[PDB]
Design a protein around this nucleic acid. Structure first.
Lengths: 326, 319
DNA sequence: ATACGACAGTTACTGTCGTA
DNA sequence: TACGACAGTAACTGTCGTAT
């Protein structure tokens, strides 16, 4: 059959580039195949590539392939070249010209490394596909994706040196302040997560207001424990508040849409027996949450926390008087 | 054991050795498996490697098959695929990850291991703020027909579980796929006129038809995408907003529509022209401005607004 | 020629369980 | 771990034809 051998030669790919070895669990997690069949694939890949090295990492053996597969399995396929540029174009069409420029550069190198003769062959079908699909563009402020602002910032955190720049807003606009670069979070605007000097909690800043950029030659590292994605998932979006358990009651009117809906990274989607759906999660940013609570109209009732009652009826009198409801 | 997967790759190993073509009458001997199964191996590789060509010397067949980027590139490709896997977009992620693999594979060691520790320094110095909305229903298979029928220019007979006529199959011209709230297939019910959009959630028991259905020479999927602000294609109203003086900054650098024009003021406000339908979806986006917005044109925007406002207004005791 | 199917019969497909 | 084995059960196999 075909389906069975596809997933094998894809695992051979997963090991051909790890360069440290993804252990049997880390090699069979991207497949969810199972233990013993994963080891059977280990021998099928050895019976495919007897140069595949096993290396220890007690308490486990990590496996890698050091010398590349056959070129048959390395030169990319149509849908993958296509899906690279549909996303790179999506960035170009979301004002994110730098994030795109990098992926475009990839595509260029990815095609000159294809033998010229074969490129012309499946150059067109790529274009057919990229035309055929399109990604939505929801409405949200233009991303402040300037390379010079991102050249200093992907390098301040590289040498782990500090950085001082001029920002506008907050309680004190204009203060050219020095901070601890952690990483950039791409969102509605573009935001940089960083910390002032020492002491406190990592504040928020919008790239749109960055001038006087220098790579402050005064090294300063972060708290080693900290992954930026963890700080990301704190809030329901951007605004960082006192993190809040929330629980929502969805009518049956929108039951089966609530099942496949995605509120937060910490969802608790278990259905009431009587048709409703109760959803609990935990994050800050309770106003942006009310904004998403418009989308459901009369199909959800804020049950807890009762701070959402305040924020919701707040924004329904804030946009209700200015429109002509009450 | 596990023979089926390993004995097959050794077929593509010779389809890359030939460059002139091997026939079933040969391959069935160079594998010792027999002809009727050799006739299935070709189909298998053709499903993996459409690059396999069939040089035909009458009256038999023959068969043959025909970098070093910056950390920045790799980390950006990675973070993209991750923001895909974090959205439920399984089909579009699975491919960006595969593309990272196939070029990591083709890198020499002392460099592929020299910049392997550098990728993740970046991959955790950025992460993308995934947004609330349904999981895009992307199953490799129920988009696989659609790609075949767009390449082969064929038609797509598919059952549909929604839209006032659910239960039986119906033919359309496969025109495009718009990835949005959910995932969408825009098609022409019949031919001529304007396109109607179908949610992929409710399309199953598809089949590509050997009755090739050609699309018009002059259709633009991005245009139709713009035709409705957001998703559902209402009438195209000429939309006209005024944003109060405060949120000019984000308005001036906002992106309401692809056919939008941001005209500033003198009194303090900002004037907004654009043109597309979707009154509900836009009343939603205008809730996220509060009271800095005065709807001018059309009149149905005001209505859809007050409709979907007091619907929650009496629902949440705020009125 | 090859594509291509139906149809008994077989022997790999899982997951689970054992010892050196 | 690197390893078989258990049936338990769906796919793999090859005789046999149809189909230009």
């Amino acid at each position: 059959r075909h389906e069975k051998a596809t997933r094998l030669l894809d695992l051979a790919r997963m090991l051909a580039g790890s360069a440290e070895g993804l252990t049997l669990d880390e090699m069979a997690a991207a497949l969810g195949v199972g233990r013993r069949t994963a080891e059977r694939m280990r021998d099928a890949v050895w019976a495919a590539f007897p140069q595949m090295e096993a290396i220890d990492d007690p308490p486990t053996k990590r496996f890698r392939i050091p010398s590349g597969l056959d070129g048959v399995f390395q030169t990319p396929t149509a849908e993958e070249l296509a899906a690279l540029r549909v996303a790179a174009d999506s960035l170009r069409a979301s004002g994110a010209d730098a994030r795109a420029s990098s992926l475009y550069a990839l595509e260029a190198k990815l095609l000159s490394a294809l033998r010229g003769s074969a490129r012309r062959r499946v150059a067109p079908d790529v274009e057919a596909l990229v035309q055929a699909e399109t990604i939505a563009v929801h409405a949200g402020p233009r991303p402040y994706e300037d390379q010079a602002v991102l050249g200093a910032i992907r390098a301040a955190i590289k040498g782990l040196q500090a950085l001082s720049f001029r920002y506008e807003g907050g309680s004190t606009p204009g203060r050219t302040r020095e901070v601890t670069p952690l990483g950039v979070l791409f969102g509605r605007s573009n935001y940089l997560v960083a910390l002032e000097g020492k002491g406190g909690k990592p504040r928020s800043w919008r790239l749109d207001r960055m001038s006087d950029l220098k790579v402050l030659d005064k090294p300063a590292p972060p708290p080693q424990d900290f992954s930026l994605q963890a700080f990301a998932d704190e809030s329901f979006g951007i605004y960082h508040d006192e993190i809040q358990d929330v629980v929502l009651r969805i009518h049956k009117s929108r039951a089966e849409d609530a099942l496949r809906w995605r509120f937060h990274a910490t969802q608790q989607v278990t259905p009431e027996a009587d048709g409703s759906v109760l959803v609990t999660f935990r994050a800050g940013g309770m106003r942006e949450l009310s904004w998403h609570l418009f989308t459901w109209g009369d199909a959800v009732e804020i049950v807890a926390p009762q701070v959402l009652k305040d924020m919701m009826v707040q924004e329904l009198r804030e946009a209700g008087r200015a429109h002509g409801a009450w």
